[PDB]
Design a protein that fits this description.
This is part of a larger assembly, with chains A (355 residues) and B (338 residues). With 355 residues, chain A is mainly beta. In chain A, 6% of the residues lie in helices and 39% in strands. With 338 residues, chain B is mainly α. Helices cover 73% and strands 2% of the residues of chain B. Chain B is elongated and about 125 Å long. Classes of the chains: A mainly beta (355), B mainly alpha (338).
Chain lengths: 355, 338
């Protein structure tokens, strides 16, 4: 289960896309379909989404209810409707589509009509229009690193976009381990305004997940190789590096309800929750979801019925099983003065880093 | 003391440590106010009153230094990581109070060296379990997401190698002959042994890969396009291995080191090969639909139109050889007839 997404209206439906990231380990003519599960009945998927090729990443769109957009292994971009499922209504042109498997697929919420930005392994980043796929993506950007006269194209494995950050700033994580921010401009097609960890922040392994806490937009944590790091908006180096971990961390996401605690899922099948409110030095707790490696972790936002924000977390195993874990009420519920304490500690850490 | 006030470590526990540091900075200012007032004095050689003040001031500096040693020791234990502890040392690099703080630093250096021993052992133990899976190309392998398996092993080795050597540059920075310490020397021997094993594995991969690249060159030269089954459903016969070899070369450029020999021409046309395959794929899908989706009554009614296309594409399949591609013209005639 390469990517897991949550229903925008509430945590009642989860969309999971299945594909094999191993190079040439996928059997010829293997099944390439996406199933959207329902919390009420877990025996089988409520609806089935059929695509020409396996979809690496599928995410829900808040702007249009029950609309799912995914990136195929071939690099084709497809859109499905949650209510009817079946075949995909919108498919991008193959040749004009970016080469290699899609790495990340996200929906830009700052538009009258939903738009999707796709970052993948060809070292390019493209912005697409759902209403008018037309002749390829509207904007094409190659992730050159180091500027100057030395240009090397490095594939981007992570794309981070937030409403608080706005449409102006896009966060991208390269295969080399550096993070590049691209700012869309009416005047010039694309600008790589900031390079993150060019010298001291380079990750040993390619960055897989880049996320920013919902409570504070300025602080965003990138999970790369053994240990995920947290960087401030204007500092090239990471503000805080947390320990080291067994195997590698496939995906780490901030808790929407509480800024202080962020969850990282390792490739050893163990998920560990890091809470900075109580102890910065050690993991709050470690849980083994399954023997199989955890490919990705998604945390629900907003909510309805008996489920509050951050109560349910969905983690996708390498085996293909998807498990929803109900977090403890104390962990999800904001603790007294958590927002004030985290801001003071983060600002203090940022000041120490500047010195 | 002025430098100490500016320091903002912001590591592990916060504010309470800063408040203690702020009081220590104030404590130094209070001593300056006593000494700072300097009634009479003015460093007179004849006056011995200043010397008495110096001794009182000497005790105050020692009290300030003693508090700094305690706070510094607590912070080092709190970080719990070699990188985190090292960062704290850089902040206080100019704040060491000579011998008072220096004695505490020696105790800190052995603890930091011990931590690197655990990381080296953990990397090595992880490496051995990971190495067996990578060689057999087993599922849930160390290589991240999807990448060429032979190319990925070299990239994976580099990530492990980078983690091991990040501390060594920082370690060489430490003064007071920490190198002389036998414990430090033992850790260095362990690090050298781990690096040598990784290179051999990389050399086997690159060595074995080099031989595979020579075999792969032949596959591109003699694949062509092959039609299979009773129905003439022509499909690209480009060896799936070629795709891995071409994608394999791009990863090597990202990891630098030494590029393959004679794989450049393939990498030179790598962009062209991708464009040609997409164009070739579209006509093949179009050419198969007419071949097998045609109605039974339709084919008999106009056999000549379908047969001419087959005769037209019959030479094209024979023509196929990645050695020289004239598919743009081949494509224009084939797409228009298809």
């Amino acid at each position: 289960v390469s990517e897991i997404s949550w229903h925008p209206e509430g945590p009642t439906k989860v969309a999971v896309s299945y594909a094999i990231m191993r190079f040439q380990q996928m059997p010829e003519k293997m099944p390439t379909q996406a199933y959207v599960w329902d919390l009420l009945n877990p025996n089988s998927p409520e609806i089935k989404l059929m695509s020409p090729s396996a979809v690496t990443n599928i995410s829900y769109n808040q702007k249009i209810p029950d609309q799912i957009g995914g990136g195929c292994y071939n690099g084709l971009l497809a859109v499905w409707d949650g209510r009817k499922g079946e075949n995909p209504i919108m498919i991008s042109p193959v040749e004009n589509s970016h080469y290699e498997p899609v790495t990340h697929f996200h929906w830009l919420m700052s538009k009258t009509g939903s738009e999707c930005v796709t970052t993948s392994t060809d070292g390019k980043v493209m912005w697409w229009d759902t209403r008018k796929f037309e002749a390829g993506p509207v904007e094409k950007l190659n992730i050159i690193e180091g500027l100057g006269e030395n240009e090397e194209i490095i594939g981007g494995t992570a794309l981070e976009y937030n409403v608080e950050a706005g449409p102006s700033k896009f966060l991208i994580g390269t295969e080399s381990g550096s993070i590049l921010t691209a700012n869309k401009k009416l005047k010039k097609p694309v600008e790589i305004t900031t390079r993150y960890g060019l010298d001291q922040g380079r990750h040993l392994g390619p960055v897989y997940s880049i996320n920013r806490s919902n409570q504070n937009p300025k602080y965003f944590l990138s999970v790369g190789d053994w240990s995920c790091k947290i960087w401030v908006e204007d500092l090239k180096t990471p503000i805080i590096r947390t320990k080291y971990h067994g195997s590698y961390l496939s995906d780490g996401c901030w808790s929407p309800t509480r800024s202080g605690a962020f969850f990282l899922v390792r490739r050893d099948g163990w998920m560990d929750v890091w809470d900075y409110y109580y102890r910065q030095n050690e993991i709050a707790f470690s849980h083994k979801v399954s023997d199989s490696p955890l490919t990705c972790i998604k945390i629900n936002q907003t909510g309805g019925a008996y489920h509050n924000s951050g109560k349910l977390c969905a983690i996708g195993d390498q085996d293909g099983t998807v498990t929803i874990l109900e977090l403890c009420d104390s962990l999800y519920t904001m603790q007294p003065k958590e927002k004030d304490i985290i801001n003071e500690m983060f600002e203090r850490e940022y000041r120490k880093e500047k010195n | 003391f002025n430098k100490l006030e500016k320091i903002e470590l912001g590591g592990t526990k916060g504010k309470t440590l800063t408040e203690s540091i702020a009081q220590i900075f104030k404590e130094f200012e209070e001593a300056v106010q006593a000494f700072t007032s300097v009634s009479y004095d003015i460093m007179n050689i004849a006056e011995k009153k200043f010397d008495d003040d110096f001794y009182e001031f000497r005790s105050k500096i020692k009290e300030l230094e003693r508090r700094l040693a305690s706070v510094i020791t607590q912070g080092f234990d709190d970080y719990d990581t070699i990188y985190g502890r090292f960062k704290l040392l850089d902040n206080f690099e100019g704040l060491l109070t000579r011998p008072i703080i220096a004695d505490e630093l020696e105790k800190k250096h052995i603890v930091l060296l011990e931590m690197y021993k655990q990381d080296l052992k953990q990397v090595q133990s992880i490496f051995l379990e990971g190495k067996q899976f990578v060689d057999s190309m087993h599922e849930n392998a160390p290589l991240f997401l999807n990448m060429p398996p032979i190319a990925g092993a070299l990239t994976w080795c580099k990530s492990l190698r980078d983690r091991i050597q990040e501390p060594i540059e920082k370690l060489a920075q430490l003064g007071q002959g920490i190198t002389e310490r036998e414990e430090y020397k033992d850790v260095q021997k362990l690090y050298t042994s781990i690096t040598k094993s990784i290179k051999d594995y990389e050399d086997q991969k690159i060595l074995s890969w080099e031989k595979e690249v020579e075999d792969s060159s032949q596959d591109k030269l003699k694949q062509t396009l092959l039609c299979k089954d009773e129905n003439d459903l022509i499909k690209v016969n480009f060896d799936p291995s070629l795709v891995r070899l071409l994608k394999e070369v791009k990863y090597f450029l990202l990891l630098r080191l030494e590029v393959p020999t004679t794989a450049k021409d393939i990498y030179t046309k790598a962009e062209t090969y991708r464009t040609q395959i997409v164009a070739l794929d579209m006509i093949v899908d179009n050419y198969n639909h007419i071949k097998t989706c045609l109605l039974p009554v339709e084919e008999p009614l106009v056999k000549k139109k379908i047969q001419d296309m087959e005769e037209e594409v019959k030479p094209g399949i024979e023509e196929i050889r990645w050695k020289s591609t004239n598919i743009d013209q081949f494509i224009s005639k084939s797409k228009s007839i298809v």
